[PDB]
């Protein structure tokens, strides 16, 4: 189209020297994201030089009814894909005046854990595999499904090509381009054994940058999906039928594990993480009850078991690590609406800081 | 349109230096193709430097067993038409951990038979004439045909121009441009006697590059018709009533045939191929019995006829070849869903290595 | 639409040196045109340095059922408007193995008669005024025309501007641009009395080349209207009723007539044309029985007339020719589906060779 | 619908005794019909008492320039299916002012022929089998034909049954019941091989009654299909190609042919009919040339063939009729757009008055 | 609408005592029917009193080339549900001119078998159940069937109620009432597991009457669904996949089995049926092998299984029947496209005449 499309893609440095910095903060329910733009004066490149901002804490649902002002802090800056130029995107944190973070921040303790000398001397690496569903505008069925109906049986959809196999690859391709342009270290994408569903894998990020990049990628996906004209649901089981349930896996790797002869280290880490499976399964995301039932390459909710090749194992280890004696292992417990901060912090703490 | 079309065509070489590389492997049923992308780090030009992957063996219906990982070996690299820049497309063949090919690979034997000193001394040339149908998204009739109805009788459609003659020349022209840009040695296109059917002829490739290029061209066509929202079927008889049945032909040549007085060579090779007619029929296509019936310039399923201008002959030789004493002969047996690897290997073996 | 529009418009000179030469030959019924593309290795500029193709002579209906191969010879090369670059369009004439022109060739005798020393010493000039109707895709009424209805009385449409007067000036303007770009020596366009109808004038093309010019212009028009989405019919009476009938006229000129004392020469030529009239009126086109009736500025089938100003005269002379000699005369006998080769050949032959 | 039906079927006899009479006369073309109604004070039963009434002949193209008045002579009385009650349908003949028939009357001569003492003393019987095609309102395709296409080949369409096999049998049933009600001798109905073409047999009414009843049945049919919203065309070849046409089988038999052993009289009658085949065909109606070629169980216009059980013969005699030695025979040559008056009158003239 | 239906339900007997005879005969395929109508002069009740009539067998594809005439023999008189009054539907058998039956008759042999003194002295009754699917008119999916998809898994569809559970039950109910009215012994109806599939039990009629009534019920059903704009296919497996198909259960019981100690007699009859089951399967109908694979409550083609409460056996005997020691048994092996004449006559033959 050409209506309103000339003004949106208008060069910024031609006239003035002003950029705009959209502000992103975690919403009230813990999963929704909110954003509101604000002009700047000079193109900034240091996240510590940005000015703090605020929003109404009683409209979203993060503050009581006596004092709604919620001070925000800027954390990271990423290049704006939807308006290019020198515009930036920032990730912010919700705090109350007086320096106390809101109960629904989840990044204060994450940064506290990851500022420890041990973790900064170990620098763990995390790779997250996110799975999301694309739903229609109104009916709220996945796109491509007939209204009140279902497509053919699953199996000829995984990494499919052509029509009737991939529904809406434009959104995912645009997402890939935008995250490669912004600065997020994305790795690759593929289909999933459910039609409409997809998946993108975030690369080996260090520290809390994993959570930062995952959140920014979720924001980019939501904006691109809004541009297209559909909605995205991150819940673990979008459809209650007999289809794949969305989830997430977390690659784990520290310096000692991938240095030399790390098989014993990964093994001991498996027992360490299995010791406290209770709180870990309780703190990986609401809605995991309908995902982990015993079907569709999933384990059971109240059991812990690990293997080397079985796809039903809650935690598995790549056979390449066994070949070489060093590598990683896959944590297949987290659901598709998890908070990367808490999961990453719990894994790092239970692995490197806990002394039984 | 401008809905996300600006983001898809974004030059990634201006900001970053990384490229992406889609992976293509032969599916489970033998005809389906699957793809999933990844991000490399440097623009590669040697196929031997690429890293290997795997995929879910129990999702494509070729699971070796408990260990579902299916290692993939990159073979050839082609420039990406749908993303331009330094993006590439690669062709991969399936394998199992342990160095053995998957049962539905059919490329291991082809490579091991085309690495023979004799065949590399003779360097056969193959020209493949693939013909496909374009059929609608929903009712599965060919595009242009009325729903539950038929257009005028065949005859005014062959190489037709204008509306009511060519149904979707845009898609085929885009395919031709993309194949010429990628690196495939495509020769030309033309219509066939049916509304919707078409044809593209692949040029004189050498060795297993014939199968590589044919498979990559099929992938490119399928992606393009996915962009256009149309499904493509390669089966020999898309419509069973009266119309022309799709198939394929295989030009063949070696050094002796096109250099010396090779009329005797080509004729004796024709009897050689006629001696092994049984498994050659059995190994050209699933569903070929609906094509070869005795009508529409097709041979029968129980005879082997070769001549000079017999339109129904299973094999014919070029008249310029006979007049000049050197050239090629045309194999009209293969169907439209063939595997180029097996047909190429069988022809080469039966004509240069197999002896009475 | 931005779908598939990026791939179609690509600059192949950026990556390779290959071009695309599309072959055009006169079909079986005499009026249909057929095409199929190929890939030349290097750009060419001499029409005598091209390879010869063939096609299935039994599919079109132009060759017998024994040896369907139909050798084609390239004649002229024109720049491709629909893909630009170094791509070319070639005009080809059919034949049979053995060098014998097909019964429906009609260009062999044209070239033979125009290679005569007298003709090449006289260099006749022909200007052709072709008029065509644009029909809808399905109903087969003209465009901008109610189904089962009529727009209104004629008179406000001739050279009309604005809506309700010109139905599809976009297609004709595109045709004008493409013909000026290709190499055709087109002169001008205008509307015609009945709505939907149009007219373009090919102007002063010397020698046999007039047939090539007009045929390539027809091909360009038909491809352009295929792109638009409507069909075009060249029959003399597209719609039966009280409406203007389509046709054609042929300007004629030779060195003697446009030299000093040319009025006597043109009068002698008109008398000669009147003397040999039966085969002329039987060879100008199939469909004159509905055009030449006696109405709408048209002569009668059973008469021959000449004049300077009468609109119903079968032939006439331009006024400036009468005033100041030189000039030409307009042959108003040919219909709208004529073969230019035979018409120009007989006109030149009757003018310069036959004696009473 | 709910309204415009209560007062369209309202009963008038309950209030008064005024009836409605529709006067029917043939237009100038000779293939369509005209009708207009006139109130009568009291109900009538015999056509003799109905007074004559005039109509404008200028618009019908049957009147001289000065005096444009035409007089009608009521002939037959039939009841009205669209008004019920005592309302009547009456057939009329156009007469010049002065006691002479209109040139396009075609019934005065028939009445003179049939009123001859020998003709009435022979009591002829006539049976006609007319066929028609139901076609749409705008696109002029037959009902059920996919627009811009053709349905399946000949097959389950000749007197077929079921959805997608027989189109619009409700109109045929409506005609059958209405013509049984009105007073028209209808024998039976059955579909035709072309999808959308039907047929109804008119009973063995005697003399001028056969023509009168057939004209009235055609009037009722075209009124019914006007009500339904479908145009009916009785042309012998509504659709040209590989589909059957429409004809009439005028079965002839007088008192002698069904009383004694007329097995040797039927052949004499056939020969008498065939003595003047040329003008006999010429007196049948336009469109006869495109149907009689030999295919679709038809005969040849320029040859006279007679047989026993061959559909290729112009005249055919049933096996039971020839076995019994008495009965009738089938006259297949008359066209479906004939004038029944002329056909029956001239057949009677040939049979009883004309001599070899 | 109100019009075009008032005169489709008129009282023809009000004016004249003419009745309408609907002649019915099987086409050449053996799975569809044909219809023809004619006016009789007086109402009849005895089928033998109805005169013979002929149809053109060339289009039917079951007539000799020289003599296309085919003679019909009325068999059974059933009252009309679409015209009411005294109008009748009659089932007819096609006879060649000469006495010998049509090759595709299947009724003369059945009549000879059933007219044998032993068969009529045993007075068998047959119970036949048939199942069918209600397909759409353009896309060949069932009714209520989400296009481009499938409905929920097999759930509340077997004789279910409510919207979105039972589709198009109005057609089935109208068929039930119409078959009760016409004179066909129909027992009951219920839904089927596949959404849109139904069935109706035909009551225990005698011998040839069972086949005649089944044919007439199929005729009436297809007429009704033609009125409703829905096509009906009695295929053994209309849709391939994880959905149930359609079959035919024949309930056979003669005097001996129904009386006294019939358990041993029915067991002996079952063994007699199983002795030569190969031609039994061969003489039921095409498409049986797709339906008979083992799943969806059926036996295997190559294996003969019998039992009492096992649905996997080709023969099932009710618990009450065996408890009482007398009754019938169910033959699940017939296909949904069977010929009732052949099945009934063959069952009677193998029961009473054919010996081991």
Residue numbers in the entry:
A (entry chain A), B (entry chain G), C (entry chain F), D (entry chain I), E (entry chain B): 1 to 356
Question: Which statements did the authors publish about this structure?
Answer:
One such an example is glutamine synthetases (GSs) (EC 6.3.1.2), one of the most ancient functioning enzymes in existence and a central enzyme in nitrogen metabolism of all living organisms, catalyzing the formation of glutamine by condensation of glutamate with ammonia using ATP as an energy source. Decades of studies have established a striking notion that all three classes of GS enzymes, despite of dramatic differences in amino acid sequences and protein sizes, share quaternary geometry in dihedral symmetry assembled with two oligomeric rings. Considering that the active sites of GS are located at the clefts formed between two neighboring protomers within the same ring and distal to the ring-ring interface, each isolated GS subcomplex ring holds multiple integral catalytic sites. Cryo-EM structure determination of GS in both the catalytically active and inactive assembly states allows us to reveal an unanticipated self-assembly-induced disorder-order transition paradigm, in which the remote interactions between two subcomplex entities significantly rigidify the otherwise structurally fluctuating active sites, thereby regulating activity.
